[PDB]
PDB file of all heavy atoms in Angstrom:
ATOM      1  N   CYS V  25       6.941   6.031   0.235  1.00 23.90           N
ATOM      2  CA  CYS V  25       7.505   5.056   1.153  1.00 23.90           C
ATOM      3  C   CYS V  25       6.495   4.810   2.287  1.00 23.90           C
ATOM      4  O   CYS V  25       5.986   5.765   2.879  1.00 23.90           O
ATOM      5  CB  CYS V  25       8.855   5.589   1.729  1.00 23.90           C
ATOM      6  SG  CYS V  25       9.707   4.374   2.720  1.00 23.90           S
ATOM      7  N   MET V  26       6.242   3.527   2.585  1.00 26.24           N
ATOM      8  CA  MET V  26       5.309   3.098   3.627  1.00 26.24           C
ATOM      9  C   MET V  26       6.057   2.310   4.673  1.00 26.24           C
ATOM     10  O   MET V  26       6.953   1.514   4.345  1.00 26.24           O
ATOM     11  CB  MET V  26       4.187   2.218   3.017  1.00 26.24           C
ATOM     12  CG  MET V  26       3.295   2.989   2.064  1.00 26.24           C
ATOM     13  SD  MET V  26       2.194   1.830   1.041  1.00 26.24           S
ATOM     14  CE  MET V  26       3.590   1.263  -0.194  1.00 26.24           C
ATOM     15  N   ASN V  27       5.655   2.470   5.921  1.00 26.69           N
ATOM     16  CA  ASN V  27       6.164   1.692   7.041  1.00 26.69           C
ATOM     17  C   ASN V  27       5.367   0.370   7.143  1.00 26.69           C
ATOM     18  O   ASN V  27       4.228   0.320   7.619  1.00 26.69           O
ATOM     19  CB  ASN V  27       6.029   2.503   8.331  1.00 26.69           C
ATOM     20  CG  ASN V  27       6.628   1.792   9.515  1.00 26.69           C
ATOM     21  OD1 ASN V  27       6.936   0.572   9.470  1.00 26.69           O
ATOM     22  ND2 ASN V  27       6.781   2.536  10.611  1.00 26.69           N
ATOM     23  N   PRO V  28       5.975  -0.761   6.703  1.00 28.13           N
ATOM     24  CA  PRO V  28       5.226  -2.018   6.650  1.00 28.13           C
ATOM     25  C   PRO V  28       4.976  -2.696   8.004  1.00 28.13           C
ATOM     26  O   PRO V  28       4.228  -3.688   8.103  1.00 28.13           O
ATOM     27  CB  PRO V  28       6.113  -2.893   5.759  1.00 28.13           C
ATOM     28  CG  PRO V  28       7.485  -2.434   6.053  1.00 28.13           C
ATOM     29  CD  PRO V  28       7.389  -0.950   6.307  1.00 28.13           C
ATOM     30  N   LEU V  29       5.619  -2.187   9.043  1.00 27.89           N
ATOM     31  CA  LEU V  29       5.448  -2.717  10.374  1.00 27.89           C
ATOM     32  C   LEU V  29       4.250  -2.050  11.075  1.00 27.89           C
ATOM     33  O   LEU V  29       3.793  -2.555  12.094  1.00 27.89           O
ATOM     34  CB  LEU V  29       6.745  -2.559  11.187  1.00 27.89           C
ATOM     35  CG  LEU V  29       7.951  -3.339  10.602  1.00 27.89           C
ATOM     36  CD1 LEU V  29       9.188  -3.243  11.500  1.00 27.89           C
ATOM     37  CD2 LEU V  29       7.575  -4.799  10.364  1.00 27.89           C
ATOM     38  N   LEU V  30       3.735  -0.968  10.513  1.00 29.94           N
ATOM     39  CA  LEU V  30       2.518  -0.313  11.031  1.00 29.94           C
ATOM     40  C   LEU V  30       1.315  -1.215  10.761  1.00 29.94           C
ATOM     41  O   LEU V  30       1.044  -1.581   9.606  1.00 29.94           O
ATOM     42  CB  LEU V  30       2.353   1.054  10.355  1.00 29.94           C
ATOM     43  CG  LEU V  30       1.143   1.958  10.638  1.00 29.94           C
ATOM     44  CD1 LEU V  30       1.273   2.647  11.976  1.00 29.94           C
ATOM     45  CD2 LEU V  30       1.003   2.980   9.511  1.00 29.94           C
ATOM     46  N   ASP V  31       0.595  -1.597  11.826  1.00 28.61           N
ATOM     47  CA  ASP V  31      -0.534  -2.497  11.712  1.00 28.61           C
ATOM     48  C   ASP V  31      -1.430  -2.160  10.546  1.00 28.61           C
ATOM     49  O   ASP V  31      -1.801  -3.043   9.772  1.00 28.61           O
ATOM     50  CB  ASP V  31      -1.342  -2.516  13.016  1.00 28.61           C
ATOM     51  CG  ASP V  31      -0.693  -3.387  14.092  1.00 28.61           C
ATOM     52  OD1 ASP V  31       0.295  -4.092  13.762  1.00 28.61           O
ATOM     53  OD2 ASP V  31      -1.161  -3.373  15.263  1.00 28.61           O
ATOM     54  N   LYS V  32      -1.757  -0.887  10.399  1.00 31.62           N
ATOM     55  CA  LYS V  32      -2.699  -0.495   9.362  1.00 31.62           C
ATOM     56  C   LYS V  32      -2.201  -0.542   7.945  1.00 31.62           C
ATOM     57  O   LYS V  32      -2.997  -0.481   7.021  1.00 31.62           O
ATOM     58  CB  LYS V  32      -3.278   0.849   9.649  1.00 31.62           C
ATOM     59  CG  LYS V  32      -2.412   2.011   9.547  1.00 31.62           C
ATOM     60  CD  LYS V  32      -3.291   3.174   9.916  1.00 31.62           C
ATOM     61  CE  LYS V  32      -2.491   4.420  10.079  1.00 31.62           C
ATOM     62  NZ  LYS V  32      -3.403   5.491  10.627  1.00 31.62           N
ATOM     63  N   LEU V  33      -0.885  -0.605   7.775  1.00 33.16           N
ATOM     64  CA  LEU V  33      -0.311  -0.748   6.445  1.00 33.16           C
ATOM     65  C   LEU V  33       0.428  -2.084   6.330  1.00 33.16           C
ATOM     66  O   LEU V  33       1.224  -2.247   5.430  1.00 33.16           O
ATOM     67  CB  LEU V  33       0.625   0.421   6.137  1.00 33.16           C
ATOM     68  CG  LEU V  33      -0.013   1.799   5.883  1.00 33.16           C
ATOM     69  CD1 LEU V  33       1.084   2.858   5.750  1.00 33.16           C
ATOM     70  CD2 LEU V  33      -0.990   1.791   4.665  1.00 33.16           C
ATOM     71  N   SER V  34       0.142  -3.047   7.207  1.00 30.94           N
ATOM     72  CA  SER V  34       0.896  -4.290   7.252  1.00 30.94           C
ATOM     73  C   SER V  34       0.448  -5.347   6.246  1.00 30.94           C
ATOM     74  O   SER V  34       1.129  -6.342   6.085  1.00 30.94           O
ATOM     75  CB  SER V  34       0.813  -4.913   8.633  1.00 30.94           C
ATOM     76  OG  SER V  34      -0.489  -5.396   8.906  1.00 30.94           O
ATOM     77  N   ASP V  35      -0.707  -5.138   5.608  1.00 32.24           N
ATOM     78  CA  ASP V  35      -1.195  -6.033   4.563  1.00 32.24           C
ATOM     79  C   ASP V  35      -0.500  -5.720   3.206  1.00 32.24           C
ATOM     80  O   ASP V  35      -0.617  -4.646   2.666  1.00 32.24           O
ATOM     81  CB  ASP V  35      -2.732  -5.914   4.488  1.00 32.24           C
ATOM     82  CG  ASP V  35      -3.354  -6.886   3.510  1.00 32.24           C
ATOM     83  OD1 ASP V  35      -3.446  -6.529   2.322  1.00 32.24           O
ATOM     84  OD2 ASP V  35      -3.765  -7.972   3.949  1.00 32.24           O
ATOM     85  N   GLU V  36       0.245  -6.673   2.661  1.00 31.16           N
ATOM     86  CA  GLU V  36       0.972  -6.432   1.420  1.00 31.16           C
ATOM     87  C   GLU V  36       0.081  -5.998   0.232  1.00 31.16           C
ATOM     88  O   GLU V  36       0.466  -5.117  -0.520  1.00 31.16           O
ATOM     89  CB  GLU V  36       1.786  -7.687   1.049  1.00 31.16           C
ATOM     90  CG  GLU V  36       2.551  -7.540  -0.250  1.00 31.16           C
ATOM     91  CD  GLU V  36       3.593  -8.638  -0.432  1.00 31.16           C
ATOM     92  OE1 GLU V  36       3.418  -9.726   0.153  1.00 31.16           O
ATOM     93  OE2 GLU V  36       4.592  -8.387  -1.138  1.00 31.16           O
ATOM     94  N   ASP V  37      -1.088  -6.612   0.086  1.00 27.71           N
ATOM     95  CA  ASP V  37      -2.041  -6.263  -0.973  1.00 27.71           C
ATOM     96  C   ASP V  37      -2.498  -4.806  -0.904  1.00 27.71           C
ATOM     97  O   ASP V  37      -2.611  -4.156  -1.945  1.00 27.71           O
ATOM     98  CB  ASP V  37      -3.260  -7.176  -0.895  1.00 27.71           C
ATOM     99  CG  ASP V  37      -4.423  -6.745  -1.836  1.00 27.71           C
ATOM    100  OD1 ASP V  37      -4.427  -7.176  -3.016  1.00 27.71           O
ATOM    101  OD2 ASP V  37      -5.350  -6.011  -1.374  1.00 27.71           O
ATOM    102  N   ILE V  38      -2.745  -4.280   0.308  1.00 27.62           N
ATOM    103  CA  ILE V  38      -3.117  -2.891   0.449  1.00 27.62           C
ATOM    104  C   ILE V  38      -1.959  -2.002   0.044  1.00 27.62           C
ATOM    105  O   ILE V  38      -2.130  -1.027  -0.695  1.00 27.62           O
ATOM    106  CB  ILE V  38      -3.548  -2.507   1.908  1.00 27.62           C
ATOM    107  CG1 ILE V  38      -4.911  -3.108   2.206  1.00 27.62           C
ATOM    108  CG2 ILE V  38      -3.606  -1.005   2.081  1.00 27.62           C
ATOM    109  CD1 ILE V  38      -6.036  -2.517   1.371  1.00 27.62           C
ATOM    110  N   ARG V  39      -0.749  -2.359   0.489  1.00 29.30           N
ATOM    111  CA  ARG V  39       0.409  -1.593   0.078  1.00 29.30           C
ATOM    112  C   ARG V  39       0.631  -1.626  -1.442  1.00 29.30           C
ATOM    113  O   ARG V  39       0.981  -0.602  -2.008  1.00 29.30           O
ATOM    114  CB  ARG V  39       1.687  -2.044   0.792  1.00 29.30           C
ATOM    115  CG  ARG V  39       1.646  -1.800   2.303  1.00 29.30           C
ATOM    116  CD  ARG V  39       3.076  -1.823   2.947  1.00 29.30           C
ATOM    117  NE  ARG V  39       3.781  -3.058   2.626  1.00 29.30           N
ATOM    118  CZ  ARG V  39       3.682  -4.213   3.296  1.00 29.30           C
ATOM    119  NH1 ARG V  39       2.897  -4.327   4.375  1.00 29.30           N
ATOM    120  NH2 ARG V  39       4.374  -5.274   2.883  1.00 29.30           N
ATOM    121  N   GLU V  40       0.421  -2.780  -2.060  1.00 28.77           N
ATOM    122  CA  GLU V  40       0.512  -2.901  -3.530  1.00 28.77           C
ATOM    123  C   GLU V  40      -0.583  -2.068  -4.199  1.00 28.77           C
ATOM    124  O   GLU V  40      -0.333  -1.394  -5.202  1.00 28.77           O
ATOM    125  CB  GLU V  40       0.468  -4.375  -3.978  1.00 28.77           C
ATOM    126  CG  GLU V  40       1.732  -5.200  -3.606  1.00 28.77           C
ATOM    127  CD  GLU V  40       3.042  -4.557  -4.132  1.00 28.77           C
ATOM    128  OE1 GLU V  40       3.104  -4.210  -5.338  1.00 28.77           O
ATOM    129  OE2 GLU V  40       3.991  -4.376  -3.336  1.00 28.77           O
ATOM    130  N   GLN V  41      -1.800  -2.078  -3.632  1.00 28.51           N
ATOM    131  CA  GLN V  41      -2.859  -1.232  -4.194  1.00 28.51           C
ATOM    132  C   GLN V  41      -2.459   0.220  -4.147  1.00 28.51           C
ATOM    133  O   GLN V  41      -2.675   0.945  -5.126  1.00 28.51           O
ATOM    134  CB  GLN V  41      -4.182  -1.406  -3.463  1.00 28.51           C
ATOM    135  CG  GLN V  41      -4.922  -2.645  -3.761  1.00 28.51           C
ATOM    136  CD  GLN V  41      -6.311  -2.579  -3.164  1.00 28.51           C
ATOM    137  OE1 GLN V  41      -7.083  -1.700  -3.514  1.00 28.51           O
ATOM    138  NE2 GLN V  41      -6.626  -3.500  -2.263  1.00 28.51           N
ATOM    139  N   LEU V  42      -1.883   0.644  -3.012  1.00 25.08           N
ATOM    140  CA  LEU V  42      -1.418   2.046  -2.864  1.00 25.08           C
ATOM    141  C   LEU V  42      -0.323   2.418  -3.869  1.00 25.08           C
ATOM    142  O   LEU V  42      -0.326   3.534  -4.417  1.00 25.08           O
ATOM    143  CB  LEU V  42      -0.959   2.411  -1.448  1.00 25.08           C
ATOM    144  CG  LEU V  42      -2.062   2.540  -0.409  1.00 25.08           C
ATOM    145  CD1 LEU V  42      -1.472   2.522   1.010  1.00 25.08           C
ATOM    146  CD2 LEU V  42      -2.887   3.838  -0.717  1.00 25.08           C
ATOM    147  N   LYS V  43       0.629   1.512  -4.093  1.00 23.28           N
ATOM    148  CA  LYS V  43       1.623   1.758  -5.105  1.00 23.28           C
ATOM    149  C   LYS V  43       0.988   1.994  -6.468  1.00 23.28           C
ATOM    150  O   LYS V  43       1.341   2.953  -7.167  1.00 23.28           O
ATOM    151  CB  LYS V  43       2.594   0.563  -5.186  1.00 23.28           C
ATOM    152  CG  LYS V  43       3.517   0.443  -3.996  1.00 23.28           C
ATOM    153  CD  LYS V  43       4.336  -0.822  -4.071  1.00 23.28           C
ATOM    154  CE  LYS V  43       5.234  -1.039  -2.882  1.00 23.28           C
ATOM    155  NZ  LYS V  43       5.957  -2.341  -3.026  1.00 23.28           N
ATOM    156  N   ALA V  44       0.066   1.100  -6.838  1.00 23.99           N
ATOM    157  CA  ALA V  44      -0.635   1.183  -8.106  1.00 23.99           C
ATOM    158  C   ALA V  44      -1.415   2.491  -8.181  1.00 23.99           C
ATOM    159  O   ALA V  44      -1.502   3.115  -9.240  1.00 23.99           O
ATOM    160  CB  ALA V  44      -1.584  -0.019  -8.286  1.00 23.99           C
ATOM    161  N   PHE V  45      -2.015   2.895  -7.066  1.00 25.41           N
ATOM    162  CA  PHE V  45      -2.809   4.122  -7.074  1.00 25.41           C
ATOM    163  C   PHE V  45      -1.934   5.334  -7.307  1.00 25.41           C
ATOM    164  O   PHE V  45      -2.267   6.204  -8.111  1.00 25.41           O
ATOM    165  CB  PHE V  45      -3.547   4.311  -5.758  1.00 25.41           C
ATOM    166  CG  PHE V  45      -4.569   5.440  -5.790  1.00 25.41           C
ATOM    167  CD1 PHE V  45      -5.895   5.169  -6.010  1.00 25.41           C
ATOM    168  CD2 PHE V  45      -4.159   6.771  -5.557  1.00 25.41           C
ATOM    169  CE1 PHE V  45      -6.850   6.198  -6.040  1.00 25.41           C
ATOM    170  CE2 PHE V  45      -5.089   7.806  -5.571  1.00 25.41           C
ATOM    171  CZ  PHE V  45      -6.429   7.518  -5.812  1.00 25.41           C
ATOM    172  N   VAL V  46      -0.823   5.395  -6.579  1.00 25.48           N
ATOM    173  CA  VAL V  46       0.071   6.520  -6.690  1.00 25.48           C
ATOM    174  C   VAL V  46       0.671   6.667  -8.103  1.00 25.48           C
ATOM    175  O   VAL V  46       0.848   7.788  -8.557  1.00 25.48           O
ATOM    176  CB  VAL V  46       1.167   6.479  -5.569  1.00 25.48           C
ATOM    177  CG1 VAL V  46       2.197   7.543  -5.795  1.00 25.48           C
ATOM    178  CG2 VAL V  46       0.519   6.631  -4.196  1.00 25.48           C
ATOM    179  N   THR V  47       0.927   5.558  -8.804  1.00 28.01           N
ATOM    180  CA  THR V  47       1.453   5.594 -10.183  1.00 28.01           C
ATOM    181  C   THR V  47       0.393   5.729 -11.263  1.00 28.01           C
ATOM    182  O   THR V  47       0.715   5.641 -12.452  1.00 28.01           O
ATOM    183  CB  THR V  47       2.273   4.328 -10.479  1.00 28.01           C
ATOM    184  OG1 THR V  47       1.424   3.168 -10.411  1.00 28.01           O
ATOM    185  CG2 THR V  47       3.414   4.193  -9.481  1.00 28.01           C
ATOM    186  N   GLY V  48      -0.872   5.907 -10.882  1.00 31.47           N
ATOM    187  CA  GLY V  48      -1.961   6.023 -11.860  1.00 31.47           C
ATOM    188  C   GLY V  48      -2.457   4.735 -12.494  1.00 31.47           C
ATOM    189  O   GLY V  48      -3.319   4.787 -13.353  1.00 31.47           O
ATOM    190  N   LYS V  49      -1.928   3.576 -12.093  1.00 33.93           N
ATOM    191  CA  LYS V  49      -2.383   2.292 -12.649  1.00 33.93           C
ATOM    192  C   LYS V  49      -3.810   1.932 -12.195  1.00 33.93           C
ATOM    193  O   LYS V  49      -4.455   1.095 -12.828  1.00 33.93           O
ATOM    194  CB  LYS V  49      -1.410   1.136 -12.329  1.00 33.93           C
ATOM    195  CG  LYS V  49      -0.030   1.265 -12.992  1.00 33.93           C
ATOM    196  CD  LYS V  49       0.863   0.034 -12.783  1.00 33.93           C
ATOM    197  N   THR V  50      -4.283   2.543 -11.103  1.00 35.17           N
ATOM    198  CA  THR V  50      -5.660   2.380 -10.621  1.00 35.17           C
ATOM    199  C   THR V  50      -6.147   3.693 -10.021  1.00 35.17           C
ATOM    200  O   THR V  50      -5.345   4.502  -9.565  1.00 35.17           O
ATOM    201  CB  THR V  50      -5.752   1.255  -9.563  1.00 35.17           C
ATOM    202  OG1 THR V  50      -7.121   1.069  -9.174  1.00 35.17           O
ATOM    203  CG2 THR V  50      -4.863   1.588  -8.312  1.00 35.17           C
ATOM    204  N   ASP V  51      -7.461   3.910 -10.014  1.00 32.86           N
ATOM    205  CA  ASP V  51      -8.019   5.060  -9.268  1.00 32.86           C
ATOM    206  C   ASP V  51      -9.006   4.566  -8.191  1.00 32.86           C
ATOM    207  O   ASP V  51      -9.866   5.311  -7.722  1.00 32.86           O
ATOM    208  CB  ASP V  51      -8.626   6.109 -10.228  1.00 32.86           C
ATOM    209  CG  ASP V  51      -9.720   5.546 -11.109  1.00 32.86           C
ATOM    210  OD1 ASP V  51     -10.850   5.407 -10.606  1.00 32.86           O
ATOM    211  OD2 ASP V  51      -9.465   5.273 -12.310  1.00 32.86           O
TER     212      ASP V  51
END
């Protein structure tokens, strides 16, 4: 779970990349 209102995690693409990373879809 990410706080999307945090400036540093506020970019949707970065959050999507992180989701993909955590599920092994990307390294």
Side-chain angles (χ1 to χ4, degrees), residues 25-48 50-51:
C25 187
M26 294 167 283
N27 184 346
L29 298 184
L30 177 76
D31 281 352
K32 69 181 171 188
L33 288 174
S34 69
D35 185 273
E36 179 166 25
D37 171 88
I38 288 294
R39 295 198 306 275
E40 291 305 310
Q41 285 190 60
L42 288 165
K43 289 174 183 178
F45 190 98
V46 173
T47 64
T50 183
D51 58 79

